[PDB]
Amino acid sequence: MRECISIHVGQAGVQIGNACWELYCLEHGIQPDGQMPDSFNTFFSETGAGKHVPRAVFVDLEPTVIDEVRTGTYRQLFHPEQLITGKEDAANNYARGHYTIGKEIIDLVLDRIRKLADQCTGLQGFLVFHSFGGGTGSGFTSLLMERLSVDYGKKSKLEFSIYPAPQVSTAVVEPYNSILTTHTTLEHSDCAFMVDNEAIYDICRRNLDIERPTYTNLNRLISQIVSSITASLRFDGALNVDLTDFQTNLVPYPRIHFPLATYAPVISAEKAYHEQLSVAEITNACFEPANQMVKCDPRHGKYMACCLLYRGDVVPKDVNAAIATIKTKRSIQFVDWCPTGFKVGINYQPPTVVPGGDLAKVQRAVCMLSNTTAIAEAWARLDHKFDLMYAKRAFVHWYVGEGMEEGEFSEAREDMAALEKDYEEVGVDSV
Amino acid sequence: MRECISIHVGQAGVQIGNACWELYCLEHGIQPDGQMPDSFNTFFSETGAGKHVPRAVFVDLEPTVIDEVRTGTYRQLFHPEQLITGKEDAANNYARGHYTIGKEIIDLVLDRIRKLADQCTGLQGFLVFHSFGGGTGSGFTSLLMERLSVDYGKKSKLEFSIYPAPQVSTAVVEPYNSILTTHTTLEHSDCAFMVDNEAIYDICRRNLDIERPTYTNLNRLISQIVSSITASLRFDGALNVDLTDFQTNLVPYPRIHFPLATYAPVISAEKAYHEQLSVAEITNACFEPANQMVKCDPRHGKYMACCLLYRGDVVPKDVNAAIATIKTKRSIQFVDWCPTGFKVGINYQPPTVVPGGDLAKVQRAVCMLSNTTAIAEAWARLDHKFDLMYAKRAFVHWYVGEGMEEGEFSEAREDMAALEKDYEEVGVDSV
Amino acid sequence: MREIVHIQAGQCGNQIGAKFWEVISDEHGIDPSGNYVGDSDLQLERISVYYNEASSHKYVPRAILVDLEPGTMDSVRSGAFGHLFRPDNFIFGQSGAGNNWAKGHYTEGAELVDSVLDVVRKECENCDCLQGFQLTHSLGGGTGSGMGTLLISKVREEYPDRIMNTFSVVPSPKVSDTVVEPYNATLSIHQLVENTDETYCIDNEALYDICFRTLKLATPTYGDLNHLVSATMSGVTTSLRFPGQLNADLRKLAVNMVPFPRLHFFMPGFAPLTARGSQQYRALTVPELTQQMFDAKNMMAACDPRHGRYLTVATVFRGRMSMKEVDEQMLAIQSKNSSYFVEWIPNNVKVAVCDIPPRGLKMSSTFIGNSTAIQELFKRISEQFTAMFRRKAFLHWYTGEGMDEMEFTEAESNMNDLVSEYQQYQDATA
Amino acid sequence: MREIVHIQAGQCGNQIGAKFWEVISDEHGIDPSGNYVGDSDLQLERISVYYNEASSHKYVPRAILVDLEPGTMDSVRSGAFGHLFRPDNFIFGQSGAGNNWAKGHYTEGAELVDSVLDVVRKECENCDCLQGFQLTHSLGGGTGSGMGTLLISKVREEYPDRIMNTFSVVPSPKVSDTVVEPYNATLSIHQLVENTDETYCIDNEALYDICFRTLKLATPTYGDLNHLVSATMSGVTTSLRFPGQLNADLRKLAVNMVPFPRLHFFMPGFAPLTARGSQQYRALTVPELTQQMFDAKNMMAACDPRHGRYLTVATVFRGRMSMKEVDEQMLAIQSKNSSYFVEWIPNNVKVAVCDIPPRGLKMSSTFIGNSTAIQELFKRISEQFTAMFRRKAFLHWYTGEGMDEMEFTEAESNMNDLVSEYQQYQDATA
Ligand SMILES: Nc1nc2c(ncn2[C@@H]2O[C@H](COP(=O)(O)OP(=O)(O)OP(=O)(O)O)[C@@H](O)[C@H]2O)c(=O)[nH]1
Ligand SMILES: Nc1nc2c(ncn2[C@@H]2O[C@H](COP(=O)(O)OP(=O)(O)OP(=O)(O)O)[C@@H](O)[C@H]2O)c(=O)[nH]1
Ligand SMILES: Nc1nc2c(ncn2[C@@H]2O[C@H](COP(=O)(O)OP(=O)(O)O)[C@@H](O)[C@H]2O)c(=O)[nH]1
């Protein structure tokens, strides 16, 4: 009755969705073939004969990444029409995925989303997984969000994007795509949870003792966060959090909607045995800058709002004591105009351990989603990079040759400057 | 496919063609009777029943030298109509071989060459063997080259001529014939590879330890040079060199087209056993002034372009190292306007040893064809001789009585003066 | 699905292409007779990128072999993997260009270009989604340079949007293999700068240096250099044919390596090159691959990247590795050599990772570098060109074939503009 | 195929011709009966040069025997190889010229020249490709001198483009065999200078010196002198007749040793010329042949080459020998004797080589020298002529035969012009 539709765009989104749906199948006991030997109803639809079909759409502009899914261990899980692929990727070009290649596939994906939503008695909204610094992840995602804002304007749309890391980068045009997609989706998105690959690498090294992690581990952690959220949506708990709750609590202003995600009990099995991961300890670990999953220091900014979603053997009074302790701490600073800046949800379902994974089996967990002004710094850095290239018009011909115009570059940069000014104004003291 | 026609004119040409075709038959395993007990296609034609007829014409104005062929070992090899003879030679008289006696046999040889060309699929061009100082070699060769240029204008025409030696000489009217044939063939020839009998005598004495060499050994060495070129054309190699490659890489200007041939591993078996004739060794021996087959010291001029044609067990890296070493040498000087003055060809077929010859079996060999301003000196000397006689009009009556005019002598001398001026200008520094 | 059409021009092009097709067949498990004898399913998953399936489950390379003499065609046909190519795809003349650009671009190549284009169109029609073209040739030669340039121009006119990569063996610095090398190289580059998206420059001298100093090969034949070039080509195109954690096709590399349209000349390199006797004394790990890749002496183009600044770099890894390690190594490389990367392009490195390493290896990586040091090579050629064009040496061979000296001046001006642009962006400051 | 017509005039001419045909038949294996009894196939491969094949495969010399008395015809007919010549080719008168040039050129020779010319025309028509003519005669006598000159003039009128060689026996310096020798010699040379292409001046006294001091013959006979003359004749015609490394026919030698039309008087010589007393000591090598050939003692004319300069030289070697050695010896001879060769003809030597040596020898060579020292001879004769013409001694015979003293003055003037030309070219400088 609270159906939520997951849309995975590009290689990053598709590979994160692989882990997410493996985790959901494990949590609900669904075999990879789709057979369980009504909590799942929000994400799975029963096929009459006892088969469960995910309420997901895997869309990419190239066949390889989704063709791995179509022939992988979970080939029997996804509806074959829900795995949509193009013929040529966007080639790390926003214009290709938004103007030239995207326009040839947008109708198909919208039709599939309509078919999925028709079966939904009550549609909560969409969870869009993608990457900021990709062609289809950035351009096609913006086009899809634009179309959704018209087809389902009222429904809530939450994004799970891989914000480009401050230093680590796998492409040279990431700032262009990031600025363009941010400008496009700054008004068509409700909440945008951010995670950097660099921060997750640091966490994996420090906490999980994995010296050489790959994208599989990062995707497992991101899937754990997405679980926490959709599990507050799925299972039964003392305090329940819906998508609209995230939208209402984490977004003080329509444009300041970029929370950062965090997961406290990131710990290896060997190390977990020596720690009593109490609610207070995981709450404290959530606010430790070293545990942030976006490579930005919250101490440089102020916490606009926080949303703590606990799972497992969690007592509400323990949560209250931990949050009071956090409020007492002066290393953690909150904006003046938010005297009460803590949304809290509690769920009775503890996290499930994916076999072959790295995370330990725990009785308690917490996912924090924090809207903080520190993210502004990241934006500034990104903006600077954009300038450095747009001064020379580097790579600009690639975008202009695919339907874009330099006017769009200028408009996106102006909008991003306005966003920076908005963040600066929000961070000031009311006095 | 890549068919080439060999035309042997005069006694020198015919007696060099004898050795050339002996060498070709040995290389391709063809018996002297034309039978074998498709590399043999650019120079032989298959007569259905396995007989291989050489793609060549033997033309002379007297019967003796070709009647030796018609009754010799290879009497059964050549097509009887390809061996063309007159009745009276040119008697070392250019006019007789060009105007009086040549005109009576030119049509026959042209008809035979037309038959040969028709029998060919793709005609690369002609190789004209002759002698500068002979009567038919000088006059009839010029007449034939004029007619061929009229008929096959585009096809390349390469000459293998015996340039008169600085001191050794067998005729008293050599300068007259040489100057006249050079004047006549200057505008109708592409490349003219030149050798001297005196230089080859010196090479045979010093290298092969032969104290009394005859024309047979000279012809064998010249045939080895021709075999290197036509082997670049015949067998399979790392770097292939066509006739047009010579024509293009060795002739900077239309009139400066007189390279000098050179064969590096000229050595007897007894001496060869004690030597490791590596690529570097043979390459260095190529540029030794004593190893030139034209009696000209290359140190008196500047190399304009060199064509190194390697054979057998040769490695491209070794060739590159040897050529770099040569470029390092300061005694070897190139013109200022040819920074890249090395055409390199490599063939996989090692030289074939003729049973009864003096050259020892070797694994490698290089034939170097260098255009160089040193030849200018030779030209000057030749011209000097011409003047010494033309001042007294010695022997001029013999030429005038055979359909020629003293105006032709004057025009030829002026043309050779212009050629000397061209060489002088080309040798000047570009500063 | 993303078919690539391979074209070979001249002796160098045809030989390198033969080795390239041997390498690709080994990668995809295609026997010399065309039958698939592989063991992994991934080999046939993207066979359509380079091969065309024929009746009886035989795979025919989607290659066009072009020359102006039949010798190279005969040598290729009579050899290992000779029957692999379609017989109808051997287009050749009878005369040859004679190392003359004018002959191969105006007279000898003009006649054969119509036939080659007909074959190319026929091969392109049977493509669900054409990705681009590949040309292997040599700039310093005759047939190769001129004919391949003519084909490039005509194909670009017919297929303006498709990618056009050329693996061109440009003249070496020290020793020349053809007297007229500067003329052919200048005339070829004057068109490559305008009718291609990626030009991987390769020097035979750099390959000799690699073979003698890195591989410790006493007698490196052209088979070994061609194997190196084939490895580079396969590494470049691997992400199109196999899955990985970070995919990158030709267009992705072109977008990430070409800040401006005219700056598309790259220096390639291969990471795991090691001597036979040292294969047990080295750790095959991402740090070692990166260190070997970014070394100057590993570059396949005879240019020193320390004499310029990297406009961009791409690294296509192959094998099961950790993205954390790859990203950390790239960050360390950029930080250590902060002076060798342009400051106005943050994160100069583009990373792609595949899962299937080359046969016989656990890890591999192809490095592509768009650096301003390449200008030196052009400068060198330009200098030689002038040295010969001032005295009009060998020029009557080109003019006599139907070219005007104004064309030579235009080509020289274009290459001078290219080096000027490269220097300008080397000196550009944020 | 290069037929030569041999004409013998007078007693000296007929005897030299008889010995010449003995030598030639020995060379070609023809027995005195006209039948081939040789061994090598090369003897018949060019038999047509000198012989006519008759029915029954008998070879008839292409010789015309002319005399004005029947004694010499009878002697030649009755002797070895006497049944070799065609009976129709014996054309003789009854009276004889009486050692009188006028009788043999105007009265008797005039009467018989028509028949001689008819026979010559028949011989020339029978020929396939006529090469030239040969005349053996003596200038001292009247039949030989006058008749040979008349025949030479008429044949040249009929066949102006053919080669005409005369092996003429010039008067000796010391002792004269005829009182009127200067008159006949001068009147004959006045026609030879104009109607001949090559004249080989042979003196009997030089031949006596050769046969006494070189061959150590105690009692030399005209047989031996005729053998030497035949050896030189056969050497030249063998250059023509047999295969060799460097061929040379009559026209080649004429072109290479006649810088000007009137300078065509040569001195011949034979190379080995070794006595039996020393045949076992000296080594037969090209250096020895050359040294003997260029020795002034070996010349067959009584003119010292050291008193003039060699306008030109021809060396027709015979036998298997190294061309390198021949050329080295020629160059050494020219360098050592640089003062004896005109400086304005570089390379004054024309070399020909033939594979087949003379019978009984392994090596041989014929030397033909065009030198200004020959002027001496003419000068000598000239002075003698004046000595008798001033007093008009013996002149009434010539006048009565039907001549005029103005003819004598013209002949003397022409001889003076000849000596003037020879001296001028001796004194000419580059
Ligand atoms: N966490 C995570 N990040 C990923 C993954 N795959 C790619 N990325 C990151 O996403 C960015 C690259 O975007 P792609 O995922 O390559 O983008 P795309 O949307 O597939 O774009 P095109 O292929 O250009 O159409 C880089 O920052 C990668 O590090 C993944 O599985 N997990
Ligand atoms: N290397 C070489 N030189 C030769 C050979 N035969 C003759 N010569 C040289 O060629 C020149 C003479 O040319 P001929 O060969 O006599 O010329 P032709 O063209 O036959 O002329 P005619 O017979 O006079 O019509 C001299 O330099 C000879 O030494 C030979 O077999 N080899
Ligand atoms: N790497 C490589 N270079 C080659 C090969 N064959 C020829 N070349 C180079 O190509 C250039 C000669 O051009 P070629 O290929 O002969 O010319 P074309 O066929 O006339 O276009 C020289 O630089 C040779 O070194 C080969 O197999 N491999």
Ligand SMILES: Nc1nc2c(ncn2[C@@H]2O[C@H](COP(=O)(O)OP(=O)(O)O)[C@@H](O)[C@H]2O)c(=O)[nH]1
């Ligand atoms: N060499 C040589 N000279 C001869 C011979 N017979 C005569 N003579 C010379 O020729 C001259 C005599 O002239 P001859 O030939 O008898 O005169 P003709 O009968 O008047 O023509 C003298 O010089 C003789 O010495 C001979 O057999 N051999």
Ligand SMILES: [Mg+2]
């Ligand atoms: Mg992608």
Ligand SMILES: [Mg+2]
């Ligand atoms: Mg000849």
